[PDB]
Amino acid sequence: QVGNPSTRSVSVGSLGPKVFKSEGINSNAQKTNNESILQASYLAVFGRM
């Protein structure tokens, strides 16, 4: 990031933490993970429940 500022938003893959995306990728395309993303955003801010 100090020599490649364009790499922000590029998923590092298996070496970083797991990223989160409210995608909703289905043929009717709705997000199935409204539960878990709320469970994961509580841990990004507070770090626990």
Binding site: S22, E23, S27, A29, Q30
Partner: protein, 177 residues
């Protein structure tokens, strides 16, 4: 035809009210996500020749009676008119994604499409599977999750455009059936 802006005008004209600040902010959210809407129409149109051949050869891959003798996609004269018909369905959906309203699709493509396929003998169970493969191709190209073609975008959520384009493919499928 109408777009997403003049849909709000004709709903407000039925009550003789000025469209004011109480519902302009649901049109300001159309503008503020307007770069991602154009970012997504570009990802469909760049792949649209490969989308209508992965579709109608997957319709043959799941129903081999179309290329049997007497079938709908049997000869060369008939296969070219199905491959033509795939990219008029895909072309009119991308006019409606770019407009944010489906009224160009309902007034110029799905106006008598059912009564034309009845008089031609086009099998309606196989023309749902051609559209519903193309729905799963589009949502994989909006949300950037196609396996054989990866693109590059800025970070941020765009599943509200993949779900709008999936519901335009559920009006093609629910007007011919």
């Amino acid at each position: 035809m109408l777009d997403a802006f003049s849909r709000v005008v004709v709903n407000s004209d039925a009550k003789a009210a000025y469209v004011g600040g109480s519902d302009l902010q649901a049109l300001k959210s159309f503008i503020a996500d307007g770069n991602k809407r154009l970012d997504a129409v570009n990802s469909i149109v760049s792949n649209a020749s490969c989308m209508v051949s992965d579709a109608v050869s997957g319709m043959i891959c799941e129903n081999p009676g179309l290329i049997s003798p007497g079938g709908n996609c049997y000869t060369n004269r008939r296969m070219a008119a199905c491959l033509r018909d795939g990219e008029i369905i895909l072309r009119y959906v991308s006019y409606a994604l770019l407009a944010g309203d489906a009224s160009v699709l309902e007034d110029r493509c799905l106006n008598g499409l059912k009564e034309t396929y009845i008089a031609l003998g086009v099998p309606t169970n196989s023309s749902i599977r051609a559209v519903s493969i193309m729905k799963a191709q589009a949502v994989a190209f909006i949300t950037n999750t196609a396996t054989e073609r990866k693109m590059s975008f800025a970070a941020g959520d765009c599943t509200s455009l993949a779900s709008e384009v999936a519901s335009y493919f559920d009006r093609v499928g629910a007007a011919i059936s």
